[PDB]
């Protein structure tokens, strides 16, 4: 169509970091949306649908209490202020210690009135736990409505 | 609206299998979207928002470590190749042997071609809570 759109996927080759990518196969960055500084830049004022998923994986439970967050934040052109739009927290481990693998996905989605030149960041707290190897697990998208 | 759209729901009458249905009751299959071989069929080229939820329920933890997966996959018209668009995994149990519930929600925008097919599939149909309505669904809308 002609609608501003993106669906970016985590770079599988990055190392313990969340790095958004516009790959050819089943990814999108079109109709004026740009990926600058791992951040989607809104090309025009209006309503957008904004969404993201991360999947965290761990081989067992460490001593310290583990808290996982995923967040979509808006950075305003006007001031460079950074407000949380969508977030969630997950408690993967309640005990410690063989070592069985654990998995915790987080999905965020909603509708926001945005200004041209606003940037959106999709950010986590434990990239050492991020399962970005396989595809379809880590992604970040907008589409103008 | 004349836009391709589908919201198909789990069949409650099936056993250990995920079968998609078009009820008239808060379910949709319209403006050219077809349900065939348990896959949604795209009537025209364009951008589609694609989404799905499954709800896993188990009475107690088994002796074998369980991993649960939900995947939305695209089957291309030209070759019948099948690629993962959206996927997640959950580990419902950490020790053996009190019911447990695990939801997985998937969603995203994708460029599809006319005749491209979409499957929403899971690994453990025996742990799927489709008895109650509104817990298991699979939808697209052309944007």
């Amino acid at each position: 169509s002609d609608k501003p759109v993106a669906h970016v996927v985590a770079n599988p080759q990055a190392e313990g970091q969340l790095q958004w990518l516009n790959r050819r196969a089943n990814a999108l960055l079109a109709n004026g949306v740009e990926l600058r500084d791992n951040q989607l830049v809104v090309p025009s004022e209006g309503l957008y649908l904004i969404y993201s998923q991360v999947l965290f994986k761990g081989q067992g439970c460490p001593s310290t209490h583990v808290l996982l967050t995923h967040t979509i934040s808006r950075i305003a052109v006007s001031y460079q202020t950074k407000v949380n739009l969508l977030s969630a927290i997950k408690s993967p481990c309640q005990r410690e210690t063989e070592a069985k693998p654990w998995y915790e996905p987080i999905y965020l989605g909603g509708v926001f009135q945005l200004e041209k030149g606003d940037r959106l960041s999709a950010e986590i707290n434990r990239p050492d736990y991020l399962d970005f190897a396989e595809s379809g697990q880590v992604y970040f998208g907008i589409i103008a409505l | 609206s004349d836009k391709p759209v589908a919201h198909v729901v789990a069949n409650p009458q099936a056993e250990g299998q995920l079968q998609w249905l078009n009820r008239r009751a808060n379910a949709l299959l319209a403006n050219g979207v077809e349900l065939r071989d348990n896959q949604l069929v795209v009537p025209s080229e364009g951008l589609y928002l694609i989404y799905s939820q499954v709800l896993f329920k188990g009475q107690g933890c088994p002796s074998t470590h369980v991993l649960l997966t939900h995947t939305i996959s695209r089957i291309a018209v030209s070759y019948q190749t099948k690629v993962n668009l959206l996927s997640a995994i959950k580990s419902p149990c950490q020790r053996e042997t009190k019911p447990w519930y695990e939801p997985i929600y998937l969603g995203g925008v994708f460029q599809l071609e006319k005749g491209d097919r979409l499957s929403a599939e899971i690994n453990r149909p025996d742990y799927l809570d489709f008895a109650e309505s509104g817990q298991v669904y699979f939808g697209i809308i052309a944007l």
Partner: nanobody
Amino acid sequence: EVQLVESGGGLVQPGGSLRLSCAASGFTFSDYWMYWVRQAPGKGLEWVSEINTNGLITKYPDSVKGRFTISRDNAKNTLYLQMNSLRPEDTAVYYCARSPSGFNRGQGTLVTVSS
């Protein structure tokens, strides 16, 4: 240049076991569900196994269910078919593919089950 090269085929006797292997290149392997298909002489190509990207979803026709096991190592870009309790009617050319219809299949490996 998608290449799927099959190997591990041979002569085996009824009740025998064989591990087929498939070295993949020229695509993002962890993106695609993968298949095992076979052509037996004077029969149409038959799909015998399907596996999803993460390896937790596997499907088999009634003909091999319980006796064949499909698996994959995405780090090694390799697909495997463990074939147990082999019977003479399983004798055919075996291909790994990106489709049940045989797309991107290689030369294939010949499995002969004789007494």
